[PDB]
Design a protein around this ligand. Structure first.
Ligand SMILES: OC[C@H]1O[C@H](OC[C@H]2O[C@H](OC[C@H]3O[C@H](O)[C@H](O)[C@@H](O)[C@@H]3O)[C@H](O)[C@@H](O)[C@@H]2O)[C@H](O)[C@@H](O)[C@@H]1O
Ligand SMILES: OC[C@H]1O[C@H](O)[C@H](O)[C@@H](O)[C@@H]1O
Ligand SMILES: [Ca+2]
Ligand code: NA
Length: 1036
């Protein structure tokens, strides 16, 4: 019966539905909020506070009309809040005492949402019958919803067992308790539905799909409209519904009390309810339900006047006044309930991992195992463990490796080799099976002659254990990381150059430079300093954010232009804020070190403030001189040491001389070279000190000339013997000092700071090379017996890879500026530098969707249709015709051409499905968050025209030609183990067994059953509608 006076005139409250008296609680009645005492249940009016503003102190506070700071409990704008009785500081995510009871104030807005049974500081946790429990000061188990050392926690009432990683309903409120048992309020549940005659008319007409819309896979969403049994025409006259009548579900049913309350308040604010009544989480459910029915009256009147429901679509489901829509204002329907971020959420706010549910047969999977160290990274994660997907990956690989043959009958327009993008993020079985395809197709395992015609690489170091077990592909050396410790930093911030003497990945030796006189011992590797991503994309990103405020993954053509201006001006200065120091030095190491394939980065030679190859960097001439000299001179053994002045001294002996005492051939005399590098721009030698290079026994009493000398303003570069000269002594030693040699400028050793060097750099070669001297070693057809595909020897070291793009290239404004056009035109330039393998950008059409950097600058890594390499309209790089022509031109200039194989993910799939989801990080690890595990509407279905045309088209032919690829197979791989006690990671030999795969199922469009998961989409934990009282999903 509601608010009732007793025989002494005091007010008491009885629940309008149950008749149960309110004691120790707050209730909003009409306009007022009261507290009812826990003893007799007597009313205390809590005065509505209306004027005032939320402020701060040197901590939120609230200030009244006089600007005074409020203390204790306060009824502000239909919520109850608590402010410290002295500080005035607002309580958020904690308890306060009132009427000698504990009430909890939630962490988002500090609103009173519940009662807590007790507050504990002085007990202790115990473990008991395999659970965690908490004992009070009397050693008595504590039960229920409590705070403990300030954390909200829950102990099962029957047993005392602590609840961890669960959503729990307690006294009609829903909370989540994390992996440590620490809790947060989520929402207040509705009590129960109006079961009146009015409500029975609002019931769905039937459970057919025709009666509901904005559904996905038979599930309802927050957007769903439905056909009720009856309609209250114009607010007054019930009639049967027709097939044309639809109303929003959310005008009649709410997932929780917060949304129902917000709904009433929103509708009142938009003129659909005339009342002074206040609607709060302490309103009686009966009154909330009646109010919603009165709103319907006003809704139906406006439907009659307007002859339609479009106004109502806009009112609830679109932004009005640049506010989010009503739906998006609600916690359970926006990203707040998805708990984005965390240390393992590397991109896009983190991830949702797909699982199974009896209600989702079409999105369930028996697979989804990561089969590698990482799992998620970007967009829609492909499930490379699924056998159908493994076959598709073979199909696509075949396509790329025969691209010209397939698309135009042009057999000289095919890719020769691959890069495996994000190799550690895809299942090992698909990597292994890929390598078998290359063995089948090209017989790479047979000899270095075959392997070296198809030099592939992966985006990882020694961690890529399927690529290192049989060295099927190059892995990245540690040069980049080492150089980032000792060379790239500003003065005062580099470590000593002694870290350059050995190439070590987490304590495992890749190669030792100090006295390297052997062959086929090092792990075949590539060496870099920069790539399109590595050491670049976040520094440009930082200049873009500084010059314009834009976020590094999402900006305009015009903000980028501004960032790039600042970036190149900084690149060209001695004192650099965004740019690496000592870039030519690092290249000198890359280009002279033994047992590596160097990879040149396009962006180190050319600037993105111009079109492709238009603007040379400040480093261009030094890098050309080094590539030139490498081709002419670099061969034989190596030595490396760091002297007492901190200088790194590196020598290559020349062809066929492996040690400093070998003579080699008469060819050796004019081969070999020496490099001196320092990282101390203030280096000064005294007048007696010498710096020596021990050129070896083939090089006694010999004239040498400079390739590179350090100058005051830069670097002097020489591509002929017309250069400053110096002589070895009768031991083959070159000697330098703080004086010029024969008065020649820049032949002395001293530290310098200028835009190209911070420390010292000089490179010296023997005088007298013939015109077209070439120090490189051809591969042989000698059969391999050791089980390895690649071998680190003079023939492999003779290769040179060029990464032929940057992320930040501008869009081409003419056909002639298109990357693919310009590459083709300049093919001979790359051949003359000694490039043997041209690594082209990923050629796939960009999704364009701006959800990551890759789909904002359209680099080819973010795509929807992996078969579309520029058909009809060009990619960023050209059309399919331009690509064929590029691959041909490169092939005619004696290069192989590398396909960037991107198996990890697909972007921007428009068709929606419902899948079970949990929050996860890059490792594929479940995150313990308030989202829990929920059915989720995913953007998972699509592909495009070329996928439809080509996917699966090759598999029956492939299985006829290479049946081994479709079988199961046992294999071995190296596995990287981490130690807990701080010592180095160590490798163990793991065994795998890939499954057999079918040839007769095509993936003509992607769908969720072939995916592991998705980046978070912001729909909310409760966008797919269910009964939150029992967890039961609505389904048609
Ligand atoms: O002028 C200050 C403030 O006024 C409105 O918001 C009122 C709001 O203020 C506090 O909390 C707001 C905000 O604080 C943290 O960021 C929370 O985590 C957020 O979820 C929360 O929205 C106060 O404690 C609340 O009780 C009160 O309702 C404006 O809307 C604010 O944006 C503005 O900053
Ligand atoms: O504080 C120490 C921890 O002890 C136990 O491990 C409990 O699970 C946890 O709630 C508590 O935080
Ligand atoms: Ca993956
Ligand atoms: Na090929």
């Amino acid at each position: 019966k509601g608010l009732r006076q007793d025989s002494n005139g005091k007010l008491r409250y009885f629940d309008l539905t149950t008749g149960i008296q309110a004691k120790g609680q707050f209730v909003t009645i009409g306009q007022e909020t009261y507290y009812f005492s826990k003893d007799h249940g007597d009313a205390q009016l809590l005065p509505m506070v209306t004027e005032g503003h939320y402020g701060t102190i040197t901590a939120w506070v609230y200030r009244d009309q006089n600007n005074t700071i409020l203390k204790g409990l306060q009824n502000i704008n239909g919520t109850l809040q608590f402010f410290d009785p002295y500080t005035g500081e607002q309580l958020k995510g904690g308890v306060a005492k009132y009427d000698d009871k504990l009430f909890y104030f939630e962490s988002g807005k500090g609103n009173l949402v519940s009662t807590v049974a007790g507050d504990y500081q002085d007990g202790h946790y115990i473990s008991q019958d395999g659970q965690t429990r908490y004992a009070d000061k009397q050693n008595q188990l504590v039960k229920g919803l409590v705070t403990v050392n300030g954390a909200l926690q829950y102990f099962d009432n029957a047993t005392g067992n602590q609840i961890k990683n669960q959503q729990v309903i307690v006294d009609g409120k829903t909370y989540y308790f994390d992996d440590k048992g620490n809790g947060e309020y989520l929402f207040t549940n509705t009590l129960d539905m109006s079961t009146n005659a009015f409500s029975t008319k609002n019931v769905a007409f039937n459970h057919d799909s025709s009666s509901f819309d904005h559904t996905v896979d038979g599930f309802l969403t927050a957007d769903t409209w439905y056909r009720p049994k009856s309609i209250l025409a114009n607010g007054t006259t019930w009639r049967d519904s027709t097939d044309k009548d639809m109303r929003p579900l959310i005008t009649v049913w709410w997932p929780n009390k917060n949304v129902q309350v917000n709904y009433l308040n929103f509708m009142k604010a938009n003129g659909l309810l005339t009342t002074a009544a206040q609607y709060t989480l302490h309103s009686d459910q009966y009154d909330l339900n009646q109010a919603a029915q009165d709103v319907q009256v006003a809704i139906e009147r406006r439907i009659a006047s307007e002859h339609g429901t479009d106004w109502l679509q806009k009112l609830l489901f679109e932004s009005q006044n640049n506010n989010p829509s009503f739906v998006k204002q609600q916690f359970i329907w926006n990203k707040d309930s998805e708990y984005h971020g965390g240390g393992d959420a590397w991109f896009q706010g983190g991830y949702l991992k797909y699982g199974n549910n009896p209600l989702t047969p079409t999105t369930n999977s028996d697979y989804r195992q990561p089969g590698n160290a990482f799992d998620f990274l970007l967009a829609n994660d492909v499930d490379n463990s699924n056998p159908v997907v493994q076959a598709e990956n073979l199909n696509w690989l075949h396509y790329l490796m025969n691209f010209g043959t397939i698309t135009a009958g042009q057999d000289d327009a095919n890719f020769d080799s691959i890069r495996i993008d994000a190799v550690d993020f895809i299942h090992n079985d698909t990597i292994q099976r890929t390598y078998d395809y290359l063995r089948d197709a090209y017989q790479v395992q047979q000899s270095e002659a075959k392997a070296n015609q198809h030099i592939s690489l992966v985006e990882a170091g020694l961690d890529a254990g399927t690529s290192t077990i049989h060295n099927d592909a190059l892995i990245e050396s540690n040069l980049r990381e080492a150089a980032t410790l000792s060379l790239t930093n500003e003065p005062g911030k580099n470590k000593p150059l002694t870290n350059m003497l050995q190439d070590v990945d987490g304590g495992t030796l890749i190669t030792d430079h100090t006295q390297n006189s052997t062959e086929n011992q090092a792990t075949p590797n590539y060496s870099i300093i920069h790539a399109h991503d590595k050491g670049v994309q976040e520094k440009v990103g930082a200049a873009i954010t500084d010059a314009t405020g834009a976020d590094w993954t999402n900006f305009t053509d015009e903000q980028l232009k501004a960032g790039l201006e600042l970036f190149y001006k900084d690149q060209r200065a001695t004192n650099k804020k965004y740019n690496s120091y000592n870039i030519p030095s690092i290249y000198a190491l890359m280009l002279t070190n033994k047992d590596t394939v160097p990879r040149m980065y396009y962006g180190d030679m050319y600037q993105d403030d111009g079109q492709y190859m238009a603007n040379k960097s400040i480093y261009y001439d030094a890098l050309v001189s080094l590539m030139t000299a490498r081709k002419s001179y670099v061969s034989g053994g190596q030595t490396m040491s760091v002297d007492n002045h901190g200088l790194l001294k590196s020598v290559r002996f020349g062809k066929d001389a492996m040690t400093a005492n070998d003579l080699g051939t008469s060819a050796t005399r004019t081969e070999g070279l020496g490099v001196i590098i320092g990282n101390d721009p203030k280096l000064q030698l005294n007048d007696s000190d010498k710096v020596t290079l021990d050129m070896g026994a083939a090089h006694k009493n010999q004239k040498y000339r400079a390739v590179i000398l350090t100058t005051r303003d830069g670097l002097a570069t020489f591509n002929s013997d017309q250069a400053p000269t110096a002589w070895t002594n009768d031991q083959g030693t070159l000697t330098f000092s703080n004086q010029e040699i024969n008065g020649q400028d820049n032949t002395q050793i001293r530290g310098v700071a200028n835009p190209q060097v911070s420390g010292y750099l000089a490179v010296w070669v023997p005088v007298g090379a013939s015109d077209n001297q070439d120090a490189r070693t051809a591969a042989t057809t000698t059969e391999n017996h050791d089980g390895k595909v690649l071998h680190s020897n003079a023939a492999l070291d003779s290769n040179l890879i060029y990464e032929g793009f940057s992320n930040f290239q501008p869009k081409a404004t003419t056909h002639d500026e298109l990357t693919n056009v310009v590459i083709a035109k300049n093919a001979d330039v790359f051949n003359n530098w000694g490039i043997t393998s041209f690594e082209m950008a990923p050629q796939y059409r960009s999704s364009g969707d701006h959800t990551f950097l890759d789909s904002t600058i359209d680099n080819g890594y973010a795509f929807t249709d992996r078969y579309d390499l520029g058909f009809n309209t060009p990619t960023k790089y050209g059309t399919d015709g331009d690509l064929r022509a590029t691959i041909q031109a490169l092939h005619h200039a004696n290069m192989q051409v590398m396909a960037d194989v991107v198996d990890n993910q697909v972007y921007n799939l428009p068709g929606k499905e419902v899948v079970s989801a949990t929050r996860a990080g890059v490792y594929g690890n479940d995150d313990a968050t308030g989202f829990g595990t929920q059915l989720y509407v995913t953007n998972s279905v699509g592909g495009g025209q070329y996928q439809e045309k080509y996917a699966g088209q090759y598999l029956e032919a492939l299985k006829a030609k290479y049946p081994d690829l479709f079988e199961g197979k046992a294999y071995d791989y190296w596995y990287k183990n981490y130690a807990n006690d701080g010592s180095n990671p160590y490798y163990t030999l793991s065994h795998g067994d890939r499954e057999s795969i079918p040839a007769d199922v095509a993936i003509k469009q992607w769908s969720a059953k072939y995916m592991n998961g998705t980046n978070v989409l912001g729909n909310g934990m409760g966008y797919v509608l269910k009964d939150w009282h029992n967890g039961q999903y609505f389904k048609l």
